[PDB]
Amino acid sequence: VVGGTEAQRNSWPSQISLQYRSGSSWAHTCGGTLIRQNWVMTAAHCVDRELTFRVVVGEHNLNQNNGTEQYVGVQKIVVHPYWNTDDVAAGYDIALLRLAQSVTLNSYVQLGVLPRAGTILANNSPCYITGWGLTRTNGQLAQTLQQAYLPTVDYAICSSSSYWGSTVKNSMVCAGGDGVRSGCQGDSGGPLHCLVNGQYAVHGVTSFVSRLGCNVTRKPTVFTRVSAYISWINNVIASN
Numbered sequence: 187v188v189g190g191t192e193a194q195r196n197s198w199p200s201q202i203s204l205q206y207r208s209g210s211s212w213a214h215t216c217g218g219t220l221i222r223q224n225w226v227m228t229a230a231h232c233v234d235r236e237l238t239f240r241v242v243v244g245e246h247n248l249n250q251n252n253g254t255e256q257y258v259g260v261q262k263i264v265v266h267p268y269w270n271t272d273d274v275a276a277g278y279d280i281a282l283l284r285l286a287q288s289v290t291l292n293s294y295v296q297l298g299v300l301p302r303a304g305t306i307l308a309n310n311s312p313c314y315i316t317g318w319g320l321t322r323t324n325g326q327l328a329q330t331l332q333q334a335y336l337p338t339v340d341y342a343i344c345s346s347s348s349y350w351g352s353t354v355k356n357s358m359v360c361a362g363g364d365g366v367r368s369g370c371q372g373d374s375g376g377p378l379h380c381l382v383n384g385q386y387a388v389h390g391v392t393s394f395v396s397r398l399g400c401n402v403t404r405k406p407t408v409f410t411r412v413s414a415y416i417s418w419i420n421n422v423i424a425s426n
């Protein structure tokens with residue numbers, strides 16, 4: 187997150203870190219949302235490589251023992267059947283990870299609340315992006331979970347030429363674009379938390395930014411609109 191602030195330790199407890207076994211270490215690659223004690227929603231792009239993946243729930247500081255962490259194997263990965271690796275702009279940037287164990291819910295580890303199917307937000311809707319990804323374009327990962335206020339930019343504005351044009355579909359959410367605050371490499375797969383009837387719900391899954399750079403004026407961070415996927419999501423869960 188570019189232009190963030192250090193989150194309080196307990197503000198976002200459906201945040202996970204998506205990690206890969208890197209030599210004899212584990213490295214942070216992505217974000218996620220714990221949506222069941224045994225199911226994590228992430229980007230398809232985050233599980234494109236054939237790597238060994240684990241999830242960490244209760245994470246605050248990537249480099250230090252918080253005493254809250256739970257470390258869990260990925261058992262199964264189901265990417266959306268229309269995801270294409272070479273077309274992120276075609277959307278379907280969603281995966282559902284079944285973990286090896288169920289996690290224990292406490293004040294640090296809670297389920298994300300997902301939108302009702304088909305819910306769109308009004309432009310300029312109040313939303314936060316969370317993550318441990320780069321804190322500058324071409325910069326470095328954060329050690330602590332950062333959060334940025336990133337209002338939504340409605341489709342009609344977002345899909346306009348001056349914004350993203352046709353790169354953005356209506357199965358996506360666009361949020362931000364101020365030139366100062368954004369998602370960046372490493373936040374991908376994570377939550378866009380939006381305040382709806384007094385409750386934060388996960389409306390985004392962080393998918394992409396502009397190749398010019400992460401914080402670019404009139405290039406919002408682009409998210410997979412979760413509310414376009416709720417039957418899919420429940421259909422995977424019911425059946426696996």
Ligand SMILES: *C(=O)c1c(Cl)cccc1NC(=O)[C@@H](NC(=O)OC(C)(C)C)C(C)C
Nearest residue numbers: 214215232369370371372374392393394395
């Ligand atoms: C998200 O996929 C993403 C965004 Cl939101 C903007 C720019 C690039 C990417 N790429 C990624 O996040 C890649 N992850 C990555 O580089 O993770 C770190 C920085 C931790 C090494 C994915 C392809 C995994």
Ligand SMILES: [Ca+2]
Nearest residue numbers: 247250251252
């Ligand atoms: Ca830690």
